Amino acid sequence: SSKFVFPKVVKELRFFLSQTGEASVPLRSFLTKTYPAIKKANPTLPILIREAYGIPPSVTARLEKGHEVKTNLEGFSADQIAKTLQSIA
């Protein structure tokens, strides 16, 4: 599935987005249409999707020794994000 099989450094992916609002629509559209393939290739990778009101979108990726890579995704489109996620690797 594209390049959805992340390295062994990646151990957790967290997606933050608002239940409404424009900026959260792209990340919602991606996660609604791209998650089932991503999980199907990453069974052991936990991917948390957590939503709070009034917040801009953002994505956190956790590396070894507890480091978490925050990645803001405000203004990114449904296809630009695919490049942002792989740019972690």
Partner 1 sequence: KEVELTVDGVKVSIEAGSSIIQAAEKAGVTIPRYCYHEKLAVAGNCRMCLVEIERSPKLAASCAMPVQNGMSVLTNTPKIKKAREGVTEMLLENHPLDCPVCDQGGECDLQEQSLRYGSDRGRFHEIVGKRAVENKAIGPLIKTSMNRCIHCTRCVRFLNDVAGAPEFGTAGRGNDMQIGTYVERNVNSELSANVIDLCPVGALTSKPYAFRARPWELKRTETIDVHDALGSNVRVDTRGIEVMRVLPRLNDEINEEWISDKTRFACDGLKTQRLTKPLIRQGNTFVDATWEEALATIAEGFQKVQPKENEIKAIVGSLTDLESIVALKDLVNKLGSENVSTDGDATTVPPAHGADFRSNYIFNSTIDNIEEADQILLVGTNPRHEAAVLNARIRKVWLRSDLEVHHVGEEFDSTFELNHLGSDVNALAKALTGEVGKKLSEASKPLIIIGSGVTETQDAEAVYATVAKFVTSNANIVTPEWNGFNLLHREASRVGALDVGFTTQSPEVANTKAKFIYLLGADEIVNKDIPKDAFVVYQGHHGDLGASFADVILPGSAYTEKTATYVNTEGRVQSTRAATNPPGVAREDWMIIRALSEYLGATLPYDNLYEMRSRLADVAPHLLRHEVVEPVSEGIAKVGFQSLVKPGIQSKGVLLKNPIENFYFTDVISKSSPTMAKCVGSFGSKIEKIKDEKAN
* Interaction between residue 78 and partner 1 (CB under 8 A): no
d(CA 71, CA 58): 6
Would you give the distance in Å from CA 71 to the centre of its chain?
9
* Interaction between residue 7 and partner 1 (CB under 8 A): no
| 50 and 13 Cβ atoms separated by less than 8 Å | no
* Interaction between residue 23 and partner 1 (CB under 8 A): no
| 46 and 40 Cβ atoms separated by less than 8 Å | no
d(CA 25, CA 42): 24
* Interaction between residue 82 and partner 1 (CB under 8 A): no
CB of 41 to partner 1, least distance (A): 13
CB of 86 to partner 1, least distance (A): 20
Rule CB under 8 A: which residues touch partner 1?
11-12, 14, 16, 19-20, 28, 31-32, 35-36, 39, 43-53, 55, 60, 62, 64-66, 68
